[PDB]
Design an enzyme around this catalytic site. Sequence first.
Site, PDB file in Angstrom:
ATOM      1  N   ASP A  67      -2.557  10.087  14.906  1.00 46.54           N
ATOM      2  CA  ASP A  67      -3.318   9.586  13.767  1.00 46.54           C
ATOM      3  C   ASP A  67      -3.971   8.233  14.016  1.00 46.54           C
ATOM      4  O   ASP A  67      -3.563   7.236  13.428  1.00 46.54           O
ATOM      5  CB  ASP A  67      -2.423   9.516  12.527  1.00 46.54           C
ATOM      6  N   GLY A 121       5.061   6.874   3.020  1.00 45.26           N
ATOM      7  CA  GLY A 121       4.994   6.540   1.601  1.00 45.26           C
ATOM      8  C   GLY A 121       4.548   5.112   1.338  1.00 45.26           C
ATOM      9  O   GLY A 121       3.615   4.625   1.992  1.00 45.26           O
ATOM     10  N   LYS A 136       8.610   0.198   4.792  1.00 43.77           N
ATOM     11  CA  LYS A 136       7.923   1.438   4.482  1.00 43.77           C
ATOM     12  C   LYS A 136       8.974   2.361   3.886  1.00 43.77           C
ATOM     13  O   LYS A 136       9.988   2.651   4.527  1.00 43.77           O
ATOM     14  CB  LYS A 136       7.257   2.043   5.747  1.00 43.77           C
ATOM     15  N   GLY A 140       0.780  -1.235   0.000  1.00 41.72           N
ATOM     16  CA  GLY A 140       0.000   0.000   0.000  1.00 41.72           C
ATOM     17  C   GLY A 140       0.812   1.285   0.000  1.00 41.72           C
ATOM     18  O   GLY A 140       2.046   1.253   0.055  1.00 41.72           O
TER      19      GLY A 140
HETATM   20  C1  LIG Z   1      -3.719  -1.953  -1.649  1.00 44.91           C
HETATM   21  C2  LIG Z   1      -4.249  -3.374  -1.642  1.00 44.91           C
HETATM   22  N1  LIG Z   1      -3.744  -4.238  -0.545  1.00 44.91           N
HETATM   23  C3  LIG Z   1      -3.544  -5.604  -1.096  1.00 44.91           C
HETATM   24  C4  LIG Z   1      -2.097  -6.006  -1.275  1.00 44.91           C
HETATM   25  C5  LIG Z   1      -4.650  -4.140   0.618  1.00 44.91           C
HETATM   26  C6  LIG Z   1      -4.326  -5.086   1.773  1.00 44.91           C
HETATM   27  N2  LIG Z   1      -3.184  -4.644   2.570  1.00 44.91           N
HETATM   28  C7  LIG Z   1      -2.121  -5.426   2.769  1.00 44.91           C
HETATM   29  O1  LIG Z   1      -1.976  -6.474   2.135  1.00 44.91           O
HETATM   30  C8  LIG Z   1      -1.143  -5.046   3.837  1.00 44.91           C
HETATM   31  C9  LIG Z   1      -0.435  -5.999   4.565  1.00 44.91           C
HETATM   32  C10 LIG Z   1      -0.430  -7.493   4.509  1.00 44.91           C
HETATM   33  N3  LIG Z   1       0.360  -5.333   5.460  1.00 44.91           N
HETATM   34  C11 LIG Z   1       0.189  -3.974   5.336  1.00 44.91           C
HETATM   35  C12 LIG Z   1       0.898  -3.027   6.111  1.00 44.91           C
HETATM   36  C13 LIG Z   1       1.834  -3.076   7.099  1.00 44.91           C
HETATM   37  C14 LIG Z   1       2.481  -4.268   7.745  1.00 44.91           C
HETATM   38  O2  LIG Z   1       2.311  -5.460   7.465  1.00 44.91           O
HETATM   39  N4  LIG Z   1       3.334  -3.791   8.682  1.00 44.91           N
HETATM   40  C15 LIG Z   1       3.322  -2.403   8.722  1.00 44.91           C
HETATM   41  C16 LIG Z   1       4.017  -1.544   9.572  1.00 44.91           C
HETATM   42  C17 LIG Z   1       3.824  -0.176   9.448  1.00 44.91           C
HETATM   43  C18 LIG Z   1       2.946   0.284   8.488  1.00 44.91           C
HETATM   44  F1  LIG Z   1       2.732   1.621   8.396  1.00 44.91           F
HETATM   45  C19 LIG Z   1       2.242  -0.536   7.630  1.00 44.91           C
HETATM   46  C20 LIG Z   1       2.420  -1.917   7.754  1.00 44.91           C
HETATM   47  C21 LIG Z   1      -0.758  -3.754   4.317  1.00 44.91           C
HETATM   48  C22 LIG Z   1      -1.234  -2.420   3.815  1.00 44.91           C
END
Ligand SMILES: CCN(CC)CCNC(=O)c1c(C)[nH]c(/C=C2\C(=O)Nc3ccc(F)cc32)c1C
Lengths: 289, 279
Positions: free
Chosen positions: A129, A21, A38, A19
């Site tokens: 946030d 930044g 990230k 997703g």
């Molecule tokens: C955009 C579409 N996506 C499909 C891939 C939606 C689903 N989202 C996903 O798969 C997803 C997964 C599996 N992990 C995160 C994010 C984080 C994570 O694991 N540790 C972090 C630590 C800090 C942080 F700020 C974000 C994350 C997302 C967005």
Amino acid sequence: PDIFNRDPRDHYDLLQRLGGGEVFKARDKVSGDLVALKMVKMEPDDDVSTLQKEILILKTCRHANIVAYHGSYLWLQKLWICMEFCGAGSLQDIYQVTGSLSELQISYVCREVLQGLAYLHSQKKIHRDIKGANILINDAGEVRLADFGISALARRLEFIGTPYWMAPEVAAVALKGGYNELCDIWSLGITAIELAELQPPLFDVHPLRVLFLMTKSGYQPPRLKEKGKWSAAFHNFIKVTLTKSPKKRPSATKMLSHQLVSQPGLNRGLILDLLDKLKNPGKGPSIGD
Amino acid sequence: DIFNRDPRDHYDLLQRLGGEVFKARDKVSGDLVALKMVKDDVSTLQKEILILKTCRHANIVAYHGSYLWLQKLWICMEFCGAGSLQDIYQVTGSLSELQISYVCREVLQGLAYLHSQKKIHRDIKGANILINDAGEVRLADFGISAQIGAELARRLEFIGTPYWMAPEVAAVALKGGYNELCDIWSLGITAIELAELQPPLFDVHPLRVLFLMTKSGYQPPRLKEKGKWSAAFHNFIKVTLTKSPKKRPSATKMLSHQLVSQPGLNRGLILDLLDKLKN
Ligand SMILES: CCN(CC)CCNC(=O)c1c(C)[nH]c(/C=C2\C(=O)Nc3ccc(F)cc32)c1C
Ligand SMILES: CCN(CC)CCNC(=O)c1c(C)[nH]c(/C=C2\C(=O)Nc3ccc(F)cc32)c1C
């Protein structure tokens, strides 16, 4: 702060964009452990000492409800923050597929967020946030608050030497800012509505108009749309977290003794239930076998 | 209204007025002006200049044009021959109750206008109140008032979704945590400053003053020598210095107060002060 001037690809294998930044799923080259990376775009005029301080605020967090920090990489004027991988993504990613969370699922999330918030506030940190998009869920159904304050007081320090003509409200802003850690308690109350209704209140109203109405005198805090569906405990939880005056809004430790979050039977199994729904959202197999 | 052409081409530099502001003369008309020299985002710069340019009122210094040369910004402004009220009282001593009432009325007219334009001065004090040769009162910005207003307007465009913000966070995002009524309180402190040669608590450490002001039970200041001032002056100080900004009167409301609405308030009172300045 453990910021390495090395290329992150030397230690980790980039797997997929999660997703924006931008967050990426990555694998540790030696252990094979999944991590999250990230990536934040840095400008040349950005101050290094300020970045180390911000990173160290994340590094010094040692709480189960805050995503673990493993290290950082500065390469090609881009910062790569390595953190705990949370398999189910954010609660926003989740509810957009599953629909509304139940009262017990929300109660458990609020309890876990409040534990995270009590720890942050005791360390003099403010998340600033709190929302569904910033509350992560791992494969075990556990709750983690994402990183905060990175690449986000010095200006206010200039006026401090000449306060003699300042109105009391201006002097209050100059000395301690116009808000404190209790802003997170209000954001959690809005998050509980968001989890119950799929949208924060006034989401259909223009960003600027909401800001004006929120500052306008006579502003009424939001409430849950339906009544009978939700217990008196849930309605009271929303009412007290959404206290207009921050001098009267309860602290995270005070909220932890609220009936909604102190009730028995709240565990990650409630979130594993939600996760099961996520795995198979659509109808079952049709006659075509 | 900013130009890249060096200001020395249009104006002949004169003596430094205060540092950095300079007295200057127009090379073709001979007209006296004042030039504010300031030593980086071009979006915020244009926003500051526009705040100054759109100020068109008889109680606010007039803006003429700006020059960007050698990384320095020269802001061309209306000239006021007697300088600031601070510059004046450090030579004349205390102003009289009538001279103060006249200054307060003129300032409030300038503030009612700024406030009607959704502008906040934020630095009302004797040092920012100019007096011309004709005894007229002009509000000025020696500091960074327009910069603050511009920087706030910049933060508004970049302000993320507001839907999860607490109302106090919304207030800082939208207006820095306060409103136009701060200028009313600063005017109350300025009237005491014109009467006593310094604002209240001037002799107390600034950190200590900030802690005193932000504490519960903080008493608004009062004039030191009560028998020297009328009941109307004591009351004007009382109402401008209302602790709560919900109960603090607006600049238009203040313009109907007895002290500033009374007859015989005119530039002649300041002309007497300027002659004292020359004596
Ligand atoms: C955009 C579409 N996506 C499909 C891939 C939606 C689903 N989202 C996903 O798969 C997803 C997964 C599996 N992990 C995160 C994010 C984080 C994570 O694991 N540790 C972090 C630590 C800090 C942080 F700020 C974000 C994350 C997302 C967005
Ligand atoms: C301290 C005593 N000094 C004696 C030499 C200085 C006295 N002061 C003086 O001469 C003086 C005069 C005659 N004008 C100004 C200032 C300004 C002016 O005219 N228009 C402006 C517009 C904007 C602004 F931000 C400042 C000014 C001063 C300081």
